[PDB]
Amino acid sequence: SLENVAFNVVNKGHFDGQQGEVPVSIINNTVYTKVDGVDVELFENKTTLPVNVAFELWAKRNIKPVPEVKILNNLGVDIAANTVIWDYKRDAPAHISTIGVCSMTDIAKKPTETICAPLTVFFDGRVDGQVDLFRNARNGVLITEGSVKGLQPSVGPKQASLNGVTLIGEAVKTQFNYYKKVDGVVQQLPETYFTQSRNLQEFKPRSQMEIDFLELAMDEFIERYKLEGYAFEAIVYGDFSHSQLGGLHLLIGLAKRFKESPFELEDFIPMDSTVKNYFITDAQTGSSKCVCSVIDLLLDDFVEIIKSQDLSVVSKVVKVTIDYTEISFMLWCKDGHVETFYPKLQ
Amino acid sequence: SLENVAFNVVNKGHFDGQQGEVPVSIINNTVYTKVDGVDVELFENKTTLPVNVAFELWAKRNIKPVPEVKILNNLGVDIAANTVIWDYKRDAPAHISTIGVCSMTDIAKKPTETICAPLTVFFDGRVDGQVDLFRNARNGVLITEGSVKGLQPSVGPKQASLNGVTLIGEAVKTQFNYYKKVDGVVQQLPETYFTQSRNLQEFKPRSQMEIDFLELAMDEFIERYKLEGYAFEAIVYGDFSHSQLGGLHLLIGLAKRFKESPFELEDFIPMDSTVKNYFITDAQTGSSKCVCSVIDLLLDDFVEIIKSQDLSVVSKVVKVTIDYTEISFMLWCKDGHVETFYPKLQ
Amino acid sequence: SLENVAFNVVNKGHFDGQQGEVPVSIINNTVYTKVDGVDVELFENKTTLPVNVAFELWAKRNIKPVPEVKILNNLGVDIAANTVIWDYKRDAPAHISTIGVCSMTDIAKKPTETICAPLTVFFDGRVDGQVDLFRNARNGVLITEGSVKGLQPSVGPKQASLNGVTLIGEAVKTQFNYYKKVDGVVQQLPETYFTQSRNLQEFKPRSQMEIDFLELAMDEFIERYKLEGYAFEAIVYGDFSHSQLGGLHLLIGLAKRFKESPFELEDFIPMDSTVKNYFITDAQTGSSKCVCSVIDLLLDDFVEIIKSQDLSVVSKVVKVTIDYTEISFMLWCKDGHVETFYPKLQ
Amino acid sequence: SLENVAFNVVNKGHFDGQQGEVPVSIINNTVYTKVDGVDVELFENKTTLPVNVAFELWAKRNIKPVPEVKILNNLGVDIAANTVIWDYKRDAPAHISTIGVCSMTDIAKKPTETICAPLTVFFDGRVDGQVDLFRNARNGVLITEGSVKGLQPSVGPKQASLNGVTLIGEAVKTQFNYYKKVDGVVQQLPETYFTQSRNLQEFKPRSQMEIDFLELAMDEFIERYKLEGYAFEAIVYGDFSHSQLGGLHLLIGLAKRFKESPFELEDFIPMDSTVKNYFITDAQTGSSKCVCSVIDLLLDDFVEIIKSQDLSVVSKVVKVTIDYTEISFMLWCKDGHVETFYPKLQ
Amino acid sequence: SLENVAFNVVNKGHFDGQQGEVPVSIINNTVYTKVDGVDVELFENKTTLPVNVAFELWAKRNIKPVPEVKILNNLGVDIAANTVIWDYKRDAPAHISTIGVCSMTDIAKKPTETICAPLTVFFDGRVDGQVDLFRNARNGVLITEGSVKGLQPSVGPKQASLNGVTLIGEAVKTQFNYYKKVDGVVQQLPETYFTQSRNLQEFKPRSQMEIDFLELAMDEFIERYKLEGYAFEAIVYGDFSHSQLGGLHLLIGLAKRFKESPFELEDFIPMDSTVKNYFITDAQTGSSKCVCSVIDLLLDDFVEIIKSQDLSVVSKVVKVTIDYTEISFMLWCKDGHVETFYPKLQ
RNA sequence: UUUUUUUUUUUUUUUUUUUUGUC
RNA sequence: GACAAAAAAAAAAAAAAAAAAAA
């Protein structure tokens, strides 16, 4: 019920299943509640769903550490089992349909029904009974804090999404073992790189090489790590001398430039994905690029990727598996040295 | 609850107090329900209240024969006791606040509380325990289908509103005895004339003189009933010779004209009142009046009213109690005969 | 394209697939077009879908004679193949998802895809190649204007919906042969009674018995067709002596009463179904029933139905297959004569 | 008038009572004005009130230093006399009804009428003629910058709300004297502590003890101020060793932690209150608590409160008068030392 | 088309003229697109225009360095030739109508048509053929990065707007030469002072005297630059010692005050103009002023303006040509020394 | 061009408060 | 209670203007 959902929201901040109702008014795609005789806003609908449905889904969202929405999307997840994954980037639920959560969007009460068989149902190993559900499920993705029996585990990213903020859990476990089943057979998830999912204004180095990049300048860092000939001047640091911005395809370079001169990032597609496209405008020099493929890879991982490839090719499409999906990079080289290295099709 | 109210609406047409919930989606000030997997419209909010609040009030409306909203307004009724009076003319509740109906709209759970003392609370004697409540109410208006011990009744209109349809009840009783209390003392309601509240396109004569007026022409009807010198040419029949419409202040004359030549009635104030102002445009002759005060008095009552007047006065304002309120008419007389007779201030 | 769709609407009345664009403005859930410099309304969204999606679906609706939406719902039809069935009762598309019509609501480009396998897809035989598509479809319903080789036809209702006008076609063929498949096995559709789907204010009789019912009185019609003991006086003609309405479960009775004195019908579920529930209030006697099931059966079929029942049972639930679905009735009898016969659960 | 109100807004920033009109357009719950031929936004409605009414109330808001809305709510103030108290926390007026401000929300033109008698009317002593109005008012709350003859003053908080800015006035007077009348009898306001109404990101210590708390470490501050055994480890600083956050019920601790490690606060009830509940999620350690009562008490005041308690009780509910209202604290002790002390019911 | 525009937005960040369509849903004045089965917000309508029209104008906005909209407004620019100038301050197009951009807002396809003759069309010389259009235009404004044969250039501000960022371009040329034609004859633009259009929180000095002001104290800065007797203690530095704020009509003083003590600047006319009116409340001392006309003049330019005045006047309104428009200041000399000097426009 | 009403983020009075300090 | 000085509210004056209405 909407009133019970709002009662739970005002008493605990999220749906806990308690009994009780509060006066609720819906007006202009917003849910208001009456506290001491005066309306107080509870939830603003930023989604395409009806405001009551969106409010009920937001109240029933998962407040435990859950995988980042990009990881779920790259695994082909279409629905979640008895839970709602909230995409805080879009302020909307990550999946259109739900299983046993909201009657208006529910397609089934349990994930074992026929309708959910073709769908890749996401199962949480922290909830009891879900491992057995995943075992009998035709298609599914399972995450566990430990090891499950009879299935080879794939270690996921260290970080996980918690209440809209991504963190490496210390008091809580944010590292999950990923399992996948496709048409009833347990798939072996490939060995892949993982994006750190960091923020521009809150960039914090996670390795010694990142600290070296942020503290010493261009030439010192290039010579220190034997990174000559990989065009690190433009790919990472970026070029701001021409009207059209060049390179700057690594989030660490964007953070380094922001630390000395802040710019504006227009995210014309506000979602969660491995590769993010931004409308970059340099406020200091005036350099701007309409679309700029930005991927937040670990600097050590990006260096290893750029060093593990053959430099004696004019143009080559580079297939790198990142975040359980194949990211394709454009490579341009001349005289045995790299010129540009950016994700394909931008 | 919203879902419970919608379930009651879809299973009974109105809130019957039975348990059960159905999926509900609110969008564009409208309440939709999912029947057979596809949304079905339930209620479109035409009020200023929140959509869910208005829907809950509409579901809990009174489906029993209740007095017309004009009667309650003329008696000074502000809010009703444990019921909702729905004004179908406005498609909105007839009162801003209620008692024990809608949690957001309630000012009290019982009419005995202090906050309801200054308000004239509408009581329904057909509901058990409400007569005693009206006894203990400082201000209130009570209707009863029968006699009341210790109280002198005031017989109201023969017609009442039954789910938006005004009718003279035959299988149900629609004549009520009105009792009014102000500051804890019982008031004697004045002897009153009552409007018939008939519709133009569904006009039905209720007396012999009405049938004579509807069937016979002007001169025969004027001669038979001795209506010479009372300006019935303009007041009732109406004048269509000039660019400005003349008279037409009785709905019987409007019905007679519509029977032979329909016109447009632009009701710029869609509400229930004893005197209704219309923007009349005669489609045949082109005569138009911006404000035409139309009162639905029984022709017997109007004839008695105009015959009880003193004709030897040039200008005189007549205070006659109609629908439990004083309607002031303007009476112009010349040479001992009436020239015009219309409600004041139009 | 939205502009191309609006151009097709303003040049042909519906989407035909022509090339051209017109200026389009969307505001307040409404689509406007600029004709001679002034905005002209094109489509007011009464659905829960986005206004552009709803407008595109409405323009691409089926203008050819199509089965009534109730028939499709009773047959278990979920989505339509390469066509849109517009539900004019709800002013919304009859199915949530389409095939190759609108990119927003599309789940597949052709009905042969795996996603459409579990869904019962409506195939229209008048379109070339749809019969072969239905043959290879696991679940599907096929309607044809003629015979199909190797398939036994099932004659449907004489009437079909033509732009919301349910009618018996003379210049068009409105009778179709119905074929149903579930899990790749052709089912034999049971022999059914068919509702006429007539209007109350436009009602026309389709048989001699209906004409006699309309013109003859109660007792005369009862004794002419040997209808004693079937409670036709209350079941069909209706009872208006008490405050609660009695019977009136056939549209023939509603039409007969509406002819002599009109009432109010409040359709609290404005959808298309075999059994329709109304909030009937009588403006003459004041009789009112909160819910009243009205079925538009032809009088001959209803009389055969009531004469085929066993009268020596106190209370019995009658399973009748009407409009390809089992319509359930309550049969109450006493002393070997019928007392009540109305659709159960109301 | 709406146009005059908008002219006053664009010419002086608030309704000053000037004469003149400007073009005004209302669309999408927003008021726009035409300046130099292009529409300029003036006010976007965040309230449940109509857009024009909310805009008129916002323009006529009190621009002088006024008591915080929590103080007015705790005193039982229901409606302000001849002024609007704007709640910047909710972006909505603090009171539903007004006196002599907005013709739609007026219940009376002067606070002396019978309707305002049962309500607690807020009288501002800095406006002339209001002291006498408070003297004759049945229920009212009066604030004055100085003494009032015959009335015992009650000193209020050092801070006051000035255009949404809570500050301790230096060029303006923000410390008022509070007088309350209930049923025509002057009430003696109880001795109470006052919340400082500080912000998390803009916090500034207001005492030497707070300076030591922010500057010193944990053990040094605990030992210097003799605060061992009062559970300052979890009550104040907070615990992050578990997945569930512990304590942190004072804004002093939130400020101290945010200084070293910023985190997320989701205000699920965005209103002004003495005790605030937050959806605190620690971004560094991952510790999150569903609800956390945070009160902005002065550290010296809280030390006195916790040292005035009786430690030899297992479980005890502490009644403390803060901001003219009784704040209920839950006290847990073991072995004669405090274990957990948070506001009750959270 | 709408879907083609959304395709261009999601693929390039703005309309580039690429062919292709993406599914689009418009709901609640917001344009959503479906990628990977989930709706993603592309544009939220902040305008008074229709949502689709506003979205297509936003996509076709000028992504090149363009003059600040205040400059265009002061020059009498009414429309733009084959381009859209976006007011990022209002989040709306800078002009009501367009030329060759949006069929909903077009009044002509080319600036040479009759309807655009009375309007001063803004021509961008960087686009091929626009200069020759400006020569043949009756009324228009032309900006070029270089010289124009036979015309006299009028350079504007060293800064320009690039995707909502006001910057002095280094990798791009942001200095333009302005040409104006009225009634078919070229006009000589007067010598003007230019506002720096700097931000409060990003403020950076552009001269040595500005650095001295931001670093030195009040007395030393006044004594070094011989600014005694011109009331720089109040006009620029401000007087936060009374209930009403004193002076503070230069953004440099606002930035200096904000550096040491943050405050609030309520902009009740959120547009782009030479003189900005603010409802400033000092969060430290409590000094507030309803209207604070703040001009972003260079400190050297302001000093020259205030030193070029005649001090032997009781009061005078002086016309200073700033940003190609005549800004009126209020000089308030008294005994031959300035008491206040503030802009009065807006 | 000649009025009227209103306004302007300056100063000076005039009151009415209130705040002090002294008696 | 006077007294001196604050601050506030409400008035008036000093001087240049602005909007609308008239003229």
- In order, the DSSP letters of C1-70 are -HHHHHHHHHHHSS---------EEEETTEEEEEETTEEEEEEE--SSS-HHHHHHHHHTB--S-B--HH
Give, as ranges, the nucleotides of chain G with any atom within 7 Å of a protein CB.
7-10, 14-17, 19
Report d(CA C104, CA C90) in Å as an integer. Answer: 21
Task: Give the whole-angstrom CA distance, residue D226 versus residue D209.
Answer: 12
Encode burial over C245-266: b for 16+ CB neighbours within 10 A, e otherwise: bbbbbbbbbbbbbeeeeebebe
- In the numeric block, the tokens 């062919």 are attached to E19
Apex D91 CA angle, A265 and A3, nearest 5: 100
- Residue written as token pair 């023969």: B158
Burial (0-12, 13-18, 19+ Cβ within 10 Å), D226: exposed
Which residues on C lie below 8 Å from E52 (Cβ)? 2, 24-26, 52
Cα–Cα distance measured from residue C22 to residue C2, given in angstroms and rounded to the nearest whole number: 9
Note the resolution in Å, 1 decimal: 3.2
Closest CA to D309 of D326, D333, D284, D292: D333
CA distance A163 to E238: 45
- Yes or no: say if D242 and A171 are a contact pair by the CB < 8 Å rule: yes
Distance CA E209, CA E228 (A): 16
The answer to whether the Cα torsion of B147, B149, B153, B156 is positive or negative is: negative
Cα dihedral A199, A204, A210, A213 sign: positive
* Strand partners for E320: E327
Inter-chain contact E50–C103, Cβ cutoff 8 Å?
no
Give the single-character DSSP code of A81.
B
**Strand G proximal to E337 Cβ, under 7 A:** no
Query: How many CB pairs below 8 A link A and D?
Result: 84
In the structure, how far is the CA atom of residue C229 from the C1' atom of nucleotide F15, in angstroms?
A: 100
Distance from CA of A227 to the nearest CA of D (A): 33
Q: Whole-angstrom Cα distance, residue D244 to residue C39?
A: 59
Please answer yes or no on whether D243 and A63 come within 8 Å at the CB atom. no
In this complex, which chains have at least 3 CB pairs below 8 Å with chain D? A, B, E
- E127 Cβ neighbours under 8 A, 6+ residues apart: E82, E83
Q: Could you tell me how far CA B229 lies from the centroid of its own chain?
A: 32
For strand D165-167 and strand E92-93, is the pairing parallel, antiparallel, or unpaired?
Answer: unpaired
**Residues of chain E contacting residue C34, judged by C-beta atoms under 8 Å apart:** 103-104
Write down the H helix ranges in D199-298: 208-215, 218-224, 232-235, 251-260
- Residue–nucleotide distance: A17 CA to F3 C1' (Å): 75
Q: Which residue is nearest to nucleotide G20 (CA to C1')?
A: D20
Please, what is the end-to-end C-alpha distance for chain C in angstroms? 45
Task: Report the Cα E27 to chain-centroid distance in Å.
Answer: 32
Q: Which residue has the tokens 């009207």?
A: A243
Read off the tokens for E124: 């961008």
Nucleotide nearest the Cα atom of E242 (by C1'): G7
Contacts of residue D173, defined as CB under 8 A and 6 or more positions apart, other chains included, come to D65, D145
CB-CB contact of D288 with A163 (8 Å)? yes
Helix (H) / strand (E) element for B8: namely helix B2-12
Q: How far is D105 from chain B (nearest CA, A)?
A: 13
Q: Which of D26, D44, D47, D48 to mutate to test the interface with A (most CBs of A within 10 A)?
A: D48
Taking CB atoms and an 8 Å cutoff, what residues of chain A touch C120? none
Contacts of A26 in chain B (CB under 8 A): 26, 50-52
Task: Give which of B346, B141, B108, B120 is closest to B247, Cα–Cα.
Answer: B346
Angle at B175 between CA B169 and CA B177, to 5 degrees: 165
**Measured from the CB, is E314 under 7 Å from any atom of strand G?**
yes
Solved using = cryo-EM
Which residues sit close to strand F, CB under 7 Å?
A: D 11-12, 16-20, 145-147, 149; E 244, 246-247, 249, 277, 289-293, 315, 330, 332, 334, 339-340, 342-344
Distance linking the first and last C-alpha atoms of chain B: 45
Task: Output the distance from E246 CA to G14 C1' rounded to whole Å.
Answer: 20
B290 residue type, one letter = C
> Which helix or strand (DSSP H or E) is residue A135 part of?
helix A130-136
φ, ψ (nearest 5 deg) of residue B171: -80, -20
Rounded Cα gap, residues E45 and E43, in angstroms: 6
Q: Which of C162, C164, C138, C134 minimizes the C-alpha distance to C150? A: C134
- CB of C168 closer than 8 Å to CB of C159: yes
CA of D19 to C1' of F5 (A): 9
What is the DSSP code (8-state) at residue E232?
Answer: H
Amino acid, res. E346: Q
**Cα separation of B308 and B330, whole Å?**
14
Locate D274 and state its tokens: 């003495």
Q: Do E171 and A241 touch (CB under 8 A)?
A: yes
Q: Which residues of C touch B175 (CB under 8 A)?
A: none
The DSSP annotation for E161-172 comes to EETTEEE--SSS
Which chains have at least 3 CB atom pairs separated by less than 8 Å from chain C?
A: A, B, E
| Contact, E328 CB vs strand G, < 7 Å | yes
CB contact under 8 A, C268 and B38: no
CA B73 to C1' G11, whole Å:
48
Nearest by CB to residue A10, choosing from D95, D241, D269, is: D269
Strand F: which positions are within 7 A of a protein CB? 5-11, 17-19
Distance A128 CA to G2 C1' (A): 86
Dist CA E165 CA D136 (whole Å) = 59
Residues of chain E neighbouring C1 (CB-CB closer than 8 A): 1-4, 21
Contacts of C181 (CB under 8 A, 6+ apart): C134, C137, C138, C139, C140, C141, C142, C187
Q: Return the axis-axis angle of helices E208-215 and E299-307, rounded to nearest 10°.
A: 100
Q: Is the CB of D169 under 7 A from strand G?
A: no
CB D92 within 8 A of CB D46: yes
CA B247 / C1′ G4 distance in Å: 79
Q: What residues of C are in contact with residue B37 (Cβ under 8 Å)?
A: 78, 96
* A103/chain B closest Cα distance in angstroms: 6
Name the minimum distance, in Å, from the CA of D13 to any CA of chain E: 6
